[PDB]
């Protein structure tokens, strides 16, 4: 029993984290094969104002890169841009390169963060992508280049690299192909995050998780049609639920229908009545159906 | 915001092995030429009270199956160290990290590598409660999951999961075989005493909320240490010994401990339908050091 936000083990990722220093900047890079991927603003000469990245690359001095891994230093063969990331060919192949691929995370989907502080892996925790392409990820100075990953079927999927924090605290990064999530720019100009639309699928999983744990104070016999909830959702900043069949395993092991839990969302979105669900005071959309079934049925 | 985080688990992952005895399957910690696991893996009937010493006398060492990826281990001998089975195996763990054994105390945080039938599945942070229990997420086949803490470049093994109480609390032992809270590894109903909340950790939890911009719960009102402790003794909260541990947190936020102590007494009554860091009640799971780490590095 129990439910905790969890991160898949980071052992397979830790050997790929390196310190990348250049000029006045020090951050993290991902050492896979004979490459070191890192945010391209590591070569920015002035991070206090807008950056001309075309000019910064045209004047790059490969000798100024200082990439380190324990007592090892990696020399840079060449440097190019791939989106908002620098691709640095290095003089050594990482002997601990795991079988891996690359992909992008979509809103409402969970993945793991290896928070690294200037080349030194510091912590590991799970996150969930928000509607606007952001995450809440406890990133501070020196943590750019920190890697987000997902483990599945023996393959390591790199899916996120950290870049910046918005004025409202939300955190922004890119996939390893250099595409910033949410369309944000790696420029030190003020940027806005639109309204946060909560994942309806994740909230249903959060309520199914409480029922399985034996917490049943919030459920009633009242139900709500999917079409009615979706109408309420697109008015209250909640995503639409495409099918009740997507929770067929959770409804079958608890005996509770999805339409029953939809009623609970609109009712609980008004307030928890001084009580809590799994210690939370409000609805939580950071747990996916996959992520609940894992914790609780193996 | 604020989230429970785990220290990187790479140094521990190579030590986890699947331990199977008959139809029983759980996890073990492979250190040196030894595999440590909960001793009830050899129990013939985990629904009844177990005569462990007699069960070990009737153990078939060859009935064990211990494996991890491309590693398969054979058992040479078996003994008990407290509630843990210590199996000497015919191969050393080539990646045994330098480490020590110690016990965590109430209010202290540490990391749990959740393992499912030999496969490290997840890692997450936990906090030791007053009655020697923790609130995690353990299910069948997760016994033997190891808890660890990295302090000062030193790896410490501090926990091995064993059972779940009727109220959902989770019980394990240190790596020396001593059960936390004195519970027994027997299928017998046992009760957890009244939980005493860590006042140090709640003050850190409120400091973190202030850092995140959530300051609706604050006021210029304050409460002396002597006054709070007199209140803590009769409301299931620990006493605060000094404000030095928060000197830094107070330096940045500019908020004093005595201000936050008043907030505890007031917020202990209820949050009035409002939230603090997504919580609807005071949280004592984050230590001063934990908050200083996440917020400032
Ligand atoms: C990489 N080490 C940091 C990580 C930051 C530091 C504070 N929290 C984080 O997540 N990334 C940066 O410092 C990037 C970097 C220049 C400025 N920057 C920012 O994150 C800034 N924010 C923005 O520019 C904004 F508001 F538009 F998002 C800062 C004010 C320092 C948070 C560049 C090249 C964008
Ligand atoms: C190890 N794989 C499991 C982990 C359990 C199962 C569900 N959640 C957990 O943390 N441990 C056990 O199965 C231990 C083990 C026998 C019974 N047991 C229990 O945890 C049971 N608890 C009790 O009997 C209680 F409450 F009295 F402590 C169970 C009912 C399955 C939760 C032994 C040897 C104690």
Numbering used by the authors:
A (entry chain A): 1 to 298
B (entry chain B): 2 to 298
Text from the published report:
Coronaviral Mpro is a 3C-like cysteine protease that cleaves the viral polyproteins (pp1a and pp1ab) at evolutionarily conserved sites to release non-structural proteins which are essential for viral replication and transcription in host cells. Due to its indispensable role in viral replication, evolutionary conservation among coronavirus genera (alpha, beta, gamma, delta), and absence of mammalian homologs, Mpro stood out as a promising drug target for developing pan-coronaviral therapeutics. In this study, we present crystal structures of Mpro from the feline coronavirus strain FECV-UU23 in complex with four clinically relevant inhibitors: GC376, PF-00835231, nirmatrelvir, and ibuzatrelvir. Our structural findings reveal that the active site of UU23 Mpro maintained conserved catalytic residues in addition to distinct, lineage-specific structural plasticity, especially in the loops forming the substrate binding subsites.
The binding pose of nirmatrelvir in the UU23 Mpro is highly similar to that in SARS-CoV-2 Mpro. An essential conserved hydrogen bond network with the S1’ subsite (G142, C144), S2 subsite (F139, H162, H163), S3 subsite (E165), and a water-mediated hydrogen bond with backbone atoms of L140 anchor nirmatrelvir in the UU23 Mpro active site. Unlike GC376 and PF-00835231, nirmatrelvir has a large and more rigid bicyclic P2 moiety, which replaced the water-mediated hydrogen bond between the inhibitor and residue T47 present in the other two cocrystal structures. Despite the loss of the hydrogen bond donor atom at the P2/P3 amide linkage in nirmatrelvir, the 6,6-dimethyl-3-azabicyclo [3.1.0] hexane P2 moiety was able to make extensive vdW interactions in the S2 subsite and the side chain of L164 (S3 subsite) of UU23 Mpro. The comparison of UU23 (alpha) and SARS-CoV-2 (beta) Mpro variants revealed variations in the nirmatrelvir binding mode and conformation of the flexible loops at the active site. The inhibitor was shifted away from the 180s loop and the P1’ moiety was closer to the loop residues L140 and N141 (S1 and S1’ subsites) compared to SARS-CoV-2 Mpro. Additionally, the inhibitor was more solvent exposed as the interaction of M49 with the conserved catalytic residue H41 that locks the P2 group in the S2 subsite was missing in UU23. Substitutions, particularly of M49, N141, and Q189 that shape the active site in SARS-CoV-2 Mpro, resulted in variations in the loop conformations including the way active pocket contours around the γ-lactam moiety (P1) in SARS-CoV-2 versus UU23 Mpro. Additionally, the inhibitor’s rigid bicyclic P2 group may hinder subtle rearrangements to adapt to active site variations, which may cause a shift in the overall binding mode and reduced potency against UU23 Mpro. Substitution of key residues in UU23 Mpro altered the arrangement of loops that moderately increased the nirmatrelvir’s potency, elevating its IC50 ~7.9 nM–10.5 nM (against SARS-CoV-2 variants including omicron and delta) to 55.7 ± 4.7 nM.
